[PDB]
């Protein structure tokens, strides 16, 4: 196409009006109707009550070289809206209809506003069971003074009742699983605002790829309908087994199963463990999102592990109860216990400060030591969630606050609080361009004048927190004391008395007592994603930052080493990542290059994991 000639205008130029056209090519002329609708709206949105199109022409050049398009427009004047007259079978709702109809006298007529008012009347009536209202509207034009009056013919019709709610997509899940999520009860009046709750509820569970709502009339009765939901189950969870047997490892194994839906019953499970010559690990986690019919949840986990030299082990239990307090907020609380023991520890400044605050007196530079405690704790938290998807959110925000407090009588005295937040904001009517913010904070400390135990310290960095850095790389590093090592014949020169002469810096992360991490991501569509991928893979661009610091660090005794009390040493990186919902789950592929780094930082520009978080 070479040129589109729009003629007959005086109020607007061609350059602006043509800017809303889809055409700007050969064999595409069939889309012209949409541009004409655009013109009708453009002028109708400005009060041109008499605007119309008298003719259009499309023609070929000689020898099919190009196309000319010409549109003949008759442009009228602007009309004012004097008021709105509403009459008919209002059925007692005239006050709300009038409130939805109020305008400022003298406002420019806008055809879209009229359509919106009609749609709002239908929406209002749907709330009270008027499933099929009959609403029509039309303008009255007085040309003597360019005045338009709006007339609306409203007939609410009949109330509808729901006779049965049927499902046709449950191949594995129990029927009860979906009925628990409906907020519309059978044998009661229909509410459009109540039925729509079901399509959100069935998405928040995260068990379905799609939820299709429907309303069908009963052929034998003018006032009853059936509601039918169609779902397609997403394969969820996996079972893994591996063999670690070898000539160096001996006989070893790894195995576990994790599902967010167990055999379709609604219970979540996780069973994991491994055994080899140097460490043992096992964990069992089971929880019931529905203990009672009203949504009270209950579950917990048991765990055990040990590591050989330093040498340590721990085990414990956590039982948590929780429940909703409104449609969107919920609370959790529970109790637990952990046993911990250490032996053959390398002398460290932070660890020894802890031990001295605890009343322990380890010998200087001597690995022949041990320590053990039994700690009983109280767990609690709070959540908020209005996201519209289980895996790839498009709107809403999520907040998850958690924490722990020790119980007097325990060996350790501490508290810990964390906060996990994320917000999705769309910038696209088709929800393809979205801005996602994510933040995390955490802080804790001791009570009674004692210190926080070092094994509960926070670490940051890794593909789950700050992309591009090695796991647990961000934060204060260990400083070792100079001397009872059994590795002296071969090894760390600072630990062995033969070479250990003074205090030394190191790259061994100890973690901190406070952290803050944040990032911003842009979620976008790409030209290389086909329908097979359009529904399963998300492509995004991102910028990450974060900082971890040591509360109660005392720099006054250490002048030749970095000061870890300064929280401002923020590490930052940026990059691009792809999140793919494969048959094995939401795998995450990412590459990033740190651009702001500090001494001691370890980089890992490319990371991959199996996702299933964030």
């Amino acid at each position: 196409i070479q040129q589109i000639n729009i003629v007959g205008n005086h109020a607007f130029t061609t350059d602006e009006l043509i800017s809303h056209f889809q055409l700007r090519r050969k064999y595409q002329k069939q889309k012209l109707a949409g541009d004409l609708e655009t013109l009708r709206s453009y002028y109708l949105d400005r009060g041109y009550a008499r605007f119309n199109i008298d003719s259009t022409q499309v023609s070929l050049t000689p020898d099919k070289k190009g196309i000319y398009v010409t549109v003949n427009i008759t442009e009228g004047d602007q009309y004012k809206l004097s008021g709105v007259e509403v009459s008919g079978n209002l059925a007692g709702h005239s006050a709300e209809i009038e409130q939805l109809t109020k305008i400022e006298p003298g406002e420019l007529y806008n055809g879209t506003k009229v359509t919106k008012m009609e749609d709002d009347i239908k929406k209002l009536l749907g709330r009270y069971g008027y499933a099929y209202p009959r609403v029509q509207s039309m303008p009255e034009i007085n040309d003597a003074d360019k005045t338009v009056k709006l007339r609306v013919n409203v007939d609410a019709g009949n109330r509808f009742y729901v006779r049965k709610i049927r499902f046709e997509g449950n191949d594995t899940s129990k029927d009860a699983v979906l009925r628990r999520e409906m907020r519309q009860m059978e044998g009661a009046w229909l509410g459009s605002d109540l039925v729509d709750q079901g399509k959100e509820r069935l998405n928040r569970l995260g068990f379905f790829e799609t939820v299709d709502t429907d309303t069908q009339r009963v052929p034998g009765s003018p006032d009853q309908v059936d509601v039918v939901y169609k779902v397609k189950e997403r394969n969820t969870g996996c079972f893994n087994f591996g063999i670690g047997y070898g000539t160096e490892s001996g006989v070893s194994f790894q195995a576990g199963v994790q599902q967010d839906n167990w055999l379709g019953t609604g219970y979540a499970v996780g069973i994991n463990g491994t055994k080899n010559d140097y460490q043992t690990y096992a964990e069992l986690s089971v929880t019931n999102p529905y203990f009672t019919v009203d949504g009270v949840s209950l579950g917990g986990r048991l765990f055990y592990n040990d590591f050989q030299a330093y040498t340590n082990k721990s085990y414990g239990t956590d039982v948590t109860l929780g429940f909703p307090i409104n449609e969107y907020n919920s609370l959790r609380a529970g109790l637990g216990y952990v046993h911990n023991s250490l032996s053959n520890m390398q002398p460290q400044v932070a660890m020894w400060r802890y031990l001295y605050s605890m009343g322990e007196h380890p010998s200087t530079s001597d690995q022949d030591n041990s320590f053990k405690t039994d700690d009983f704790t109280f767990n609690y938290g709070w959540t908020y969630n209005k996201l519209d998807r289980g895996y790839f959110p498009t709107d809403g925000s999520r907040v998850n606050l958690t924490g722990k407090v020790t119980i007097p009588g325990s060996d350790n005295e501490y508290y810990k609080v964390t906060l996990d937040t994320a917000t999705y904001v769309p910038i696209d009517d088709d929800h393809k361009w979205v801005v996602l913010g994510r933040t995390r904070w955490g802080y804790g400390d001791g009570l009674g004048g004692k210190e926080m135990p070092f094994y509960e310290n926070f670490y940051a960095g890794g593909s789950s927190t700050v992309r591009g850095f090695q796991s647990n790389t961000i934060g204060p590093k260990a400083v070792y004391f100079p001397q009872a090592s059994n590795y002296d014949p071969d090894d760390y020169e600072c630990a062995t008395q033969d070479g250990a002469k003074d205090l030394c810096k190191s790259d061994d992360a100890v973690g901190g007592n406070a952290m803050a991490v944040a990032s911003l991501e842009f979620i976008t569509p790409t030209p290389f994603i086909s329908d097979k991928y359009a529904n399963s893979v998300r492509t995004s661009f991102f910028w990450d930052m974060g900082t971890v610091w040591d509360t109660n660090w005392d720099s006054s005794q250490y002048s030749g080493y970095p000061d870890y009390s300064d929280p401002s040493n923020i590490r930052m990186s940026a990059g691009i990542a792809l999140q793919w919902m494969s048959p094995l789950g939401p795998l995450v592929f990412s590459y990033a290059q740190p651009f702001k780094k500090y001494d001691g930082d370890k980089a890992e520009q490319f990371q991959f994991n199996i996702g299933k978080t964030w």
Binding site: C238, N240, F241, G242, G246, T247, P583
Partner: peptide, 24 residues
Amino acid sequence: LNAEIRDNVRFGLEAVNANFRYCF
């Protein structure tokens, strides 16, 4: 040293790195 048996079913033998993965 390995095999692809079914969608969501993977097996292999890979001293050894033998493993199996099954997803529902």
